[PDB]
Design an enzyme around this catalytic site. Structure first.
Site, mmCIF file in Angstrom:
data_model
loop_
_atom_site.group_PDB
_atom_site.id
_atom_site.type_symbol
_atom_site.label_atom_id
_atom_site.label_comp_id
_atom_site.label_asym_id
_atom_site.label_seq_id
_atom_site.Cartn_x
_atom_site.Cartn_y
_atom_site.Cartn_z
ATOM 1 N N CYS A 105 0.831 -1.201 0.000
ATOM 2 C CA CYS A 105 0.000 0.000 0.000
ATOM 3 C C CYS A 105 0.868 1.254 0.000
ATOM 4 O O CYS A 105 1.643 1.486 0.935
ATOM 5 C CB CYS A 105 -0.959 0.004 1.196
ATOM 6 S SG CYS A 105 -2.201 1.431 1.274
ATOM 7 N N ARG A 108 0.044 4.651 2.818
ATOM 8 C CA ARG A 108 0.119 4.458 4.267
ATOM 9 C C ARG A 108 0.534 5.709 5.044
ATOM 10 O O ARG A 108 0.624 5.638 6.279
ATOM 11 C CB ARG A 108 1.070 3.311 4.596
ATOM 12 C CG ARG A 108 0.493 1.943 4.278
ATOM 13 C CD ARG A 108 1.494 0.831 4.555
ATOM 14 N NE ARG A 108 2.469 0.684 3.473
ATOM 15 C CZ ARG A 108 3.575 -0.050 3.579
ATOM 16 N NH1 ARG A 108 3.820 -0.682 4.721
ATOM 17 N NH2 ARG A 108 4.417 -0.165 2.554
ATOM 18 N N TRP A 277 -9.372 6.203 -0.785
ATOM 19 C CA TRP A 277 -9.648 6.901 -2.033
ATOM 20 C C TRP A 277 -8.641 6.435 -3.071
ATOM 21 O O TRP A 277 -7.579 5.891 -2.740
ATOM 22 C CB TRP A 277 -9.611 8.431 -1.887
ATOM 23 C CG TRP A 277 -8.370 8.978 -1.245
ATOM 24 C CD1 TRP A 277 -7.165 9.211 -1.849
ATOM 25 C CD2 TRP A 277 -8.218 9.391 0.120
ATOM 26 N NE1 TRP A 277 -6.273 9.727 -0.941
ATOM 27 C CE2 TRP A 277 -6.888 9.844 0.276
ATOM 28 C CE3 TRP A 277 -9.071 9.417 1.223
ATOM 29 C CZ2 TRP A 277 -6.393 10.316 1.493
ATOM 30 C CZ3 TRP A 277 -8.582 9.890 2.435
ATOM 31 C CH2 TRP A 277 -7.257 10.328 2.561
ATOM 32 N N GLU A 282 -4.607 3.758 -10.761
ATOM 33 C CA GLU A 282 -5.397 2.541 -10.609
ATOM 34 C C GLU A 282 -6.547 2.512 -11.604
ATOM 35 O O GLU A 282 -6.837 1.470 -12.199
ATOM 36 C CB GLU A 282 -5.950 2.422 -9.192
ATOM 37 C CG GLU A 282 -4.927 2.354 -8.088
ATOM 38 C CD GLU A 282 -5.619 2.316 -6.724
ATOM 39 O OE1 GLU A 282 -6.131 1.241 -6.347
ATOM 40 O OE2 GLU A 282 -5.674 3.367 -6.056
HETATM 41 C C1 HEM Z 1 -6.397 6.520 1.822
HETATM 42 C C2 HEM Z 1 -6.067 6.375 0.533
HETATM 43 C C3 HEM Z 1 -5.419 5.076 -0.022
HETATM 44 C C4 HEM Z 1 -4.739 5.029 -1.171
HETATM 45 C C5 HEM Z 1 -4.464 6.237 -2.092
HETATM 46 C C6 HEM Z 1 -4.285 3.668 -1.388
HETATM 47 C C7 HEM Z 1 -3.540 3.202 -2.457
HETATM 48 C C8 HEM Z 1 -3.246 1.871 -2.695
HETATM 49 C C9 HEM Z 1 -2.725 1.299 -3.924
HETATM 50 C C10 HEM Z 1 -2.423 2.098 -5.207
HETATM 51 C C11 HEM Z 1 -2.563 -0.018 -3.757
HETATM 52 C C12 HEM Z 1 -2.031 -0.980 -4.851
HETATM 53 C C13 HEM Z 1 -2.830 -2.276 -4.931
HETATM 54 C C14 HEM Z 1 -3.221 -2.582 -6.350
HETATM 55 O O1 HEM Z 1 -2.828 -1.811 -7.265
HETATM 56 O O2 HEM Z 1 -3.928 -3.600 -6.563
HETATM 57 C C15 HEM Z 1 -2.976 -0.333 -2.394
HETATM 58 C C16 HEM Z 1 -2.970 -1.570 -1.792
HETATM 59 C C17 HEM Z 1 -3.433 -1.942 -0.550
HETATM 60 N N1 HEM Z 1 -4.070 -1.113 0.352
HETATM 61 FE FE1 HEM Z 1 -4.081 0.936 0.095
HETATM 62 N N2 HEM Z 1 -4.729 2.907 -0.324
HETATM 63 C C18 HEM Z 1 -5.446 3.726 0.533
HETATM 64 C C19 HEM Z 1 -6.060 3.307 1.700
HETATM 65 C C20 HEM Z 1 -6.031 2.055 2.285
HETATM 66 C C21 HEM Z 1 -6.738 1.658 3.491
HETATM 67 C C22 HEM Z 1 -7.656 2.612 4.300
HETATM 68 C C23 HEM Z 1 -6.461 0.356 3.730
HETATM 69 C C24 HEM Z 1 -6.917 -0.572 4.884
HETATM 70 C C25 HEM Z 1 -7.431 -0.134 6.040
HETATM 71 C C26 HEM Z 1 -5.555 -0.101 2.692
HETATM 72 C C27 HEM Z 1 -5.026 -1.374 2.585
HETATM 73 C C28 HEM Z 1 -4.385 -1.864 1.465
HETATM 74 C C29 HEM Z 1 -3.913 -3.221 1.239
HETATM 75 C C30 HEM Z 1 -4.038 -4.410 2.214
HETATM 76 C C31 HEM Z 1 -3.349 -3.267 0.033
HETATM 77 C C32 HEM Z 1 -2.715 -4.530 -0.608
HETATM 78 C C33 HEM Z 1 -3.420 -4.804 -1.931
HETATM 79 C C34 HEM Z 1 -3.226 -6.222 -2.369
HETATM 80 O O3 HEM Z 1 -2.335 -6.903 -1.800
HETATM 81 O O4 HEM Z 1 -3.963 -6.658 -3.290
HETATM 82 N N3 HEM Z 1 -5.328 0.953 1.828
HETATM 83 N N4 HEM Z 1 -3.369 0.843 -1.788
HETATM 84 C C1 LIG Z 2 -4.217 -9.675 -5.494
HETATM 85 C C2 LIG Z 2 -5.102 -9.843 -6.714
HETATM 86 N N1 LIG Z 2 -6.079 -8.746 -6.852
HETATM 87 C C3 LIG Z 2 -7.425 -9.239 -6.529
HETATM 88 C C4 LIG Z 2 -7.843 -10.275 -7.550
HETATM 89 C C5 LIG Z 2 -5.743 -7.626 -5.963
HETATM 90 C C6 LIG Z 2 -6.644 -6.424 -6.219
HETATM 91 C C7 LIG Z 2 -6.641 -5.625 -4.939
HETATM 92 C C8 LIG Z 2 -6.903 -6.297 -3.749
HETATM 93 C C9 LIG Z 2 -6.902 -5.629 -2.532
HETATM 94 F F1 LIG Z 2 -7.162 -6.302 -1.399
HETATM 95 C C10 LIG Z 2 -6.634 -4.276 -2.489
HETATM 96 F F2 LIG Z 2 -6.629 -3.604 -1.325
HETATM 97 C C11 LIG Z 2 -6.360 -3.555 -3.748
HETATM 98 C C12 LIG Z 2 -6.064 -2.077 -3.677
HETATM 99 C C13 LIG Z 2 -7.239 -1.264 -4.188
HETATM 100 C C14 LIG Z 2 -7.353 -0.044 -3.304
HETATM 101 C C15 LIG Z 2 -7.840 -0.157 -2.009
HETATM 102 C C16 LIG Z 2 -7.938 0.978 -1.219
HETATM 103 C C17 LIG Z 2 -8.460 0.854 0.186
HETATM 104 C C18 LIG Z 2 -7.543 2.209 -1.737
HETATM 105 C C19 LIG Z 2 -7.050 2.276 -3.039
HETATM 106 N N2 LIG Z 2 -6.663 3.454 -3.594
HETATM 107 N N3 LIG Z 2 -6.974 1.154 -3.781
HETATM 108 C C20 LIG Z 2 -6.365 -4.259 -4.947
HETATM 109 CL CL LIG Z 3 -9.930 -0.845 -8.469
#
Ligand code: HEM
Ligand SMILES: CCN(CC)CCc1cc(F)c(F)c(CCc2cc(C)cc(N)n2)c1
Ligand SMILES: [Cl-]
Ligand code: HEM
Ligand SMILES: CCN(CC)CCc1cc(F)c(F)c(CCc2cc(C)cc(N)n2)c1
Ligand SMILES: C[C@H](O)[C@H](O)[C@H]1CNc2nc(N)[nH]c(=O)c2N1
Ligand SMILES: C[C@H](O)[C@H](O)[C@H]1CNc2nc(N)[nH]c(=O)c2N1
Ligand SMILES: [Cl-]
Ligand SMILES: [Gd]
Ligand SMILES: [Gd]
Ligand SMILES: [Gd]
Ligand SMILES: [Zn+2]
Lengths: 401, 401
Positions: A105, A108, A277, A282
Site C-alpha cells: 500500500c 500508508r 480513495w 489505478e
Molecule cells: C487513503 C487512501 C489510499 C490510497 C491512495 C491507497 C492506495 C493503494 C494502492 C495504489 C494499492 C495498490 C494495490 C493494487 O494496485 O492492486 C494499495 C494496496 C493496498 N491497500 Fe491501500 N490505499 C489507501 C487506503 C487504504 C486503506 C484505508 C487500507 C486498509 C485499512 C488499505 C489497505 C491496502 C492493502 C491491504 C493493500 C494490498 C493490496 C493487495 O495486496 O492486493 N489501503 N493501496
Molecule cells: C491480489 C489480486 N487482486 C485481486 C484479484 C488484488 C486487487 C486488490 C486487492 C486488494 F485487497 C486491495 F486492497 C487492492 C487495492 C485497491 C485499493 C484499495 C484501497 C483501500 C484504496 C485504493 N486506492 N486502492 C487491490
Molecule cells: Cl480498483
C-alpha cells in the site's frame, strides 16, 4: 543481519531493523526470489500475547498495571472459551496497524486516520447490508472520501463464516457474448455469473454496478441491490479533448476491498471491508488500459489520431497519459477525492522517513509501490525497499466457493 | 518448483530451472531483498565440471569419450597448475551463456548472436587499447550495431588483473562545478576525477567523451584517448518540437559495459567488455530524466508550456514521453540501431517462451525487466518472474581504485 537500504537518487543509507520481527515466512529463498508473485490449538495465545504487548508499548504502557491485567484476561478467556474478544480500543489499534503493515500500500501516510466501525454484534446478511450501507455512505461523504473499515464478527470453530463474495463493494458487471468475449469489466465475469445465478437481472451496459452477495454463517448468500443514490460515480471527460466524454467512460468514487481477511492478535475476520480513495493510475492505467480489463488504449489513440502502425511513435504511452489526465480532471471536477501518482509516491517517501524513526524501517513491496506509468519519474523507483510480513495484517483468503 | 502466472493471458508455467540455481541471492523466507541494486581447487573443479557438462550437452556429446577426456584433462591441469584454460569453442559458448543467464537483461532474445573476440593472448595495456578500438569499430558498424564481447586474459595466480577502469567504453565527463553542481554526466564524476589525476586535460562541455584508463597486470592504469571518429554520436532532435534541437543534447551509439566480471566454469575474466544496442528508455528516461543524471525533465516541460506548478497536470509524464520520442526519432534519423520499450519487452516475452521450452524456465529480475516508463503498458509487467543466479555469469566487481 540488518539489511542496508540505499536511496540511489540522494545517496542516503538506512538499516531496516524492523525486519528482524518478521513472523510469516515469505516466498523467497537464498536460491530464488519470488517477489514478483501476486499470491506467493493454544498457539492463538502467542499471537495474542504479542499483539497485546504491541498495544501497550504503543500507548507507552508496557509493564504497567492494565497491561498485566489484560494479559491475564485473554489467558483466562482462552482457557475458558478457546478464544478471546478484543477490547474496542484494541480493535481500532489493530486495524490501523494492519493497514500500516501492508507492504503493497502506497497510501500508508494516512494509516493513523482510519474510521473503524465495530460490527462484531452482527447477525444475518440483512444486518450486513445495513452495515455496508452505513460504511459506503460515511466513506463516500458526498465525494469528500474518508478512510474506513467495518469489522464483522470474527471466525469461530464449529460455525460458518461471515463473507462478502464480491472482491469490492462496487465492481461493474462483465457479460459474455455470442462469442465468449466480455462486455463490461472482464475482471468480474465470475461474480457477474454468480450474481445472475442467484436471481439478479443482468443489464446490458458496460458499467452496470453489480449487486452484493452477502453470506451469513452457514446460509446461502443473499443478493442485495445497492441504492443507486449511494454509489457515487464519475463520468470521464478530458479538459481539452472534447470527444473523450462521448466515449461514455465512467468509474466509481469509492475503492472498497471486501474479500481480504483481517488478522489481529491471532483472531481472524474474513469479513472486514476497508476503503480509502483512489490513486489515479489505478483507474486510468490499470482498470481502463490493461489488456485483460477495459482495454481502451487503442480506442483512445484512434480518437487522438495517433500513428498506431508503429510502436516507436509511443502512441500507447501518449494515449495512457491522456486517459490518466481525464481521470484526474474528472474526479476533481466532481469534487471526489483522488491523488495522482506523483503526490502519492512523494507522500510515501515521507512515510518511509517517519517509519524509519518510529519503528526502524517499513515493509514495502517495490513492485507494487512503484506506479504502473512513469515509474522512474517517481522517487520510490530509486528507493531500495525490504519486504516482509508483520502482524496485525491484511491477508488474502480463498473464495467462498 | 515455483508456479509462475501471466496475468494478461492466464498462462501458467513451472520454473524447474531455478532448482539448479547454484550461487545464493539476498532473500530469505523472512525478508525479500529483490530490490537491492547490489545483491580452493576442489570448488574450482566442481564449477569447471559443471560447465564442461553444459558445453558437451550443447553439442550433443554428453557422456561421450571427448566429454570424459575433457573432464579428465581439466582435473589434471588443475592438479598441475592450480587452474585450466578454456578451448576457443568453450569460451564462445560460455560468453553466450553468460548473456543468456543475465536476469536483468531484457535484450536476451539476441543471446545466440554474439561476436566473441578472443584477446586472451593480450600482453599489455597498449595491445588492450587496440583490441578495444577494433571492438568499438566492429560493433558500431557505421550505425548498424552488432553485439560483441572481447575477452581479455583470465585472472591467474601470480599476476595482477587486466582491468578497464571505465564503467563503459563511451562515457561523458562529469565536472564538479563552482557552485557545487555538476556539468556533464553526474554518474561519471569519480571516473572523470581519476582521468584528470592520471594526466587527462579536461574539457568543459556537457558531452565530453572520456579517455580510457586501462590496467595491465601489476601496472598502474594508462590513459588512452579514443579516436573521435571511432565514437559514433547522435544529436537529439524532436520530430515536431523544433526548439528541442537547441537543447544541444547528444548521446552515443554504442552501449559497451566494461567493468563487469565474466565467470565461466570457475575461471574469472575481470576484463571482458560487451556491447549491444540501446533500448530508448535507457537514454530518454534514465540518462536524461533521472534527477541525479542530466535532469532535463522540468526544462523540457517548461519549453512545452506545460503547467509545472501542479503534479496532477502530469507534466512530468508528458515531458518524459516526448523526450523518449526524440531519442527514437533521432537514432532512426541517424540510422543507428535502437529498440523502443514496447518492441523490446515483446521480444523478451518470446525469449521467456523459447527458454521455457529449452531449459524449463528463465531467470529474470522483474524490477529491471519492466521499463522505467509505461510499465504496465508492456507485456512483461503482467508476467510473474523467478530471479536466480546461474553460471556462466556476468558479475559486478569492486572498482580497481
Ligand atoms: C487513503 C487512501 C489510499 C490510497 C491512495 C491507497 C492506495 C493503494 C494502492 C495504489 C494499492 C495498490 C494495490 C493494487 O494496485 O492492486 C494499495 C494496496 C493496498 N491497500 Fe491501500 N490505499 C489507501 C487506503 C487504504 C486503506 C484505508 C487500507 C486498509 C485499512 C488499505 C489497505 C491496502 C492493502 C491491504 C493493500 C494490498 C493490496 C493487495 O495486496 O492486493 N489501503 N493501496
Ligand atoms: C491480489 C489480486 N487482486 C485481486 C484479484 C488484488 C486487487 C486488490 C486487492 C486488494 F485487497 C486491495 F486492497 C487492492 C487495492 C485497491 C485499493 C484499495 C484501497 C483501500 C484504496 C485504493 N486506492 N486502492 C487491490
Ligand atoms: Cl480498483
Ligand atoms: C543487443 C541488444 C541489447 C539490449 C536491447 C539490451 C538491453 C538491456 C537493458 C535495457 C538492460 C538494463 C540496463 C540498466 O537499466 O541498467 C540490460 C542489462 C544487462 N545486459 Fe543487456 N542488452 C543488449 C545486449 C547485451 C549483451 C550483448 C550483453 C552481454 C554479452 C548484455 C548483458 C547485460 C547484463 C549483464 C545486464 C545486467 C547488468 C546490470 O545489472 O546492470 N546485454 N540489457
Ligand atoms: C548497477 C550498476 N550500474 C553501473 C555501475 C549498471 C551498469 C550496467 C550494466 C549492464 F550490463 C548494462 F547493460 C547497463 C546498461 C547499458 C547497456 C549495455 C548493453 C550491453 C546493452 C544495453 N542496451 N544497455 C548498465
Ligand atoms: C507479475 C507482477 O508481480 C504483477 O503484475 C503485479 C506487479 N505490480 C503490481 N502493482 C500494483 N500496485 N498492482 C498490481 O496489480 C501489480 N501487479
Ligand atoms: C532501487 C531499485 O532497485 C533501482 O532503482 C532499480 C530498479 N529497476 C531498474 N531497472 C533497470 N533496468 N535499471 C535500473 O537501474 C533499475 N534500478
Ligand atoms: Cl547507459
Ligand atoms: Gd476527427
Ligand atoms: Gd512544431
Ligand atoms: Gd536554457
Ligand atoms: Zn525476494
Amino acid at each position: 543481519k540488518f539489511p542496508r537500504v540505499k536511496n540511489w537518487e540522494v545517496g542516503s543509507i538506512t538499516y531496516d531493523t524492523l525486519s528482524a520481527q518478521a513472523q510469516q515466512d515469505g516466498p523467497c529463498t537464498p536460491r530464488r526470489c519470488l517477489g514478483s508473485l501476486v499470491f506467493p490449538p493454544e498457539q492463538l495465545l502467542s499471537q495474542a500475547r504479542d499483539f497485546i504487548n504491541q498495544y501497550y508499548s504503543s500507548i507507552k504502557r508496557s509493564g504497567s498495571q492494565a497491561h498485566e491485567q489484560r494479559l491475564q484476561e485473554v489467558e483466562a478467556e482462552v482457557a475458558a472459551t478457546g478464544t478471546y474478544q478484543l477490547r474496542e480500543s484494541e480493535l481500532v489499534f489493530g486495524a490501523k496497524q494492519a493497514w500500516r503493515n501492508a507492504p503493497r500500500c502506497v497510501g500508508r501516510i494516512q494509516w493513523g486516520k482510519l474510521q473503524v466501525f465495530d460490527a462484531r454484534d452482527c447477525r444475518s446478511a440483512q444486518e450486513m447490508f445495513t452495515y455496508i450501507c452505513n460504511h459506503i455512505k460515511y466513506a463516500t461523504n458526498r465525494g469528500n472520501l474518508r478512510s474506513a473499515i467495518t469489522v464483522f464478527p470474527q471466525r469461530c470453530p464449529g460455525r460458518g463464516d461471515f463473507r462478502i463474495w464480491n472482491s469490492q463493494l462496487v465492481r461493474y458487471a462483465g457479460y459474455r457474448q455470442q462469442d465468449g468475449s466480455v462486455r463490461g469489466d472482464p475482471a468480474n465475469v465470475e461474480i457477474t455469473e454468480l450474481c445472475i445465478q442467484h436471481g439478479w437481472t443482468p443489464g446490458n451496459g458496460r458499467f452496470d454496478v453489480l449487486p452484493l452477495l452477502l453470506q451469513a454463517p452457514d446460509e446461502p448468500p443473499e443478493l442485495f441491490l445497492l441504492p443507486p443514490e449511494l454509489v457515487l460515480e464519475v463520468p470521464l471527460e478530458h479538459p481539452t479533448l472534447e470527444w473523450f466524454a462521448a466515449l461514455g467512460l465512467r468509474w466509481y468514487a469509492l475503492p472498497a476491498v471486501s474479500n481480504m481477511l483481517l488478522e489481529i492478535g491471532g483472531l481472524e475476520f474474513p469479513a472486514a471491508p476497508f476503503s480509502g480513495w483512489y490513486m489515479s493510475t489505478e483507474i486510468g492505467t490499470r482498470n481502463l488500459c490493461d489488456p485483460h480489463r477495459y482495454n481502451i488504449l487503442e480506442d483512445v489513440a484512434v480518437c487522438m489520431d495517433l500513428d498506431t502502425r508503429t510502436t516507436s511513435s509511443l502512441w500507447k504511452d501518449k494515449a495512457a497519459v491522456e486517459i490518466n489526465v481525464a481521470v484526474l480532471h474528472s474526479y476533481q471536477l466532481a469534487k471526489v477525492t483522488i491523488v495522482d501518482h506523483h503526490a502519492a509516491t512523494a507522500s510515501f517517501m515521507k512515510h518511509l522517513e517517519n517509519e524509519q524513526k518510529a519503528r526502524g524501517g517499513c515493509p514495502a513491496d517495490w513492485a507494487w509501490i512503484v506506479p504502473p506509468i512513469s515509474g522512474s519519474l517517481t522517487p520510490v523507483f530509486h528507493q531500495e525497499m525490504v519486504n516482509y510480513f508483520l502482524s496485525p495484517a491484511f491477508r488474502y483468503q480463498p473464495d467462498p466457493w
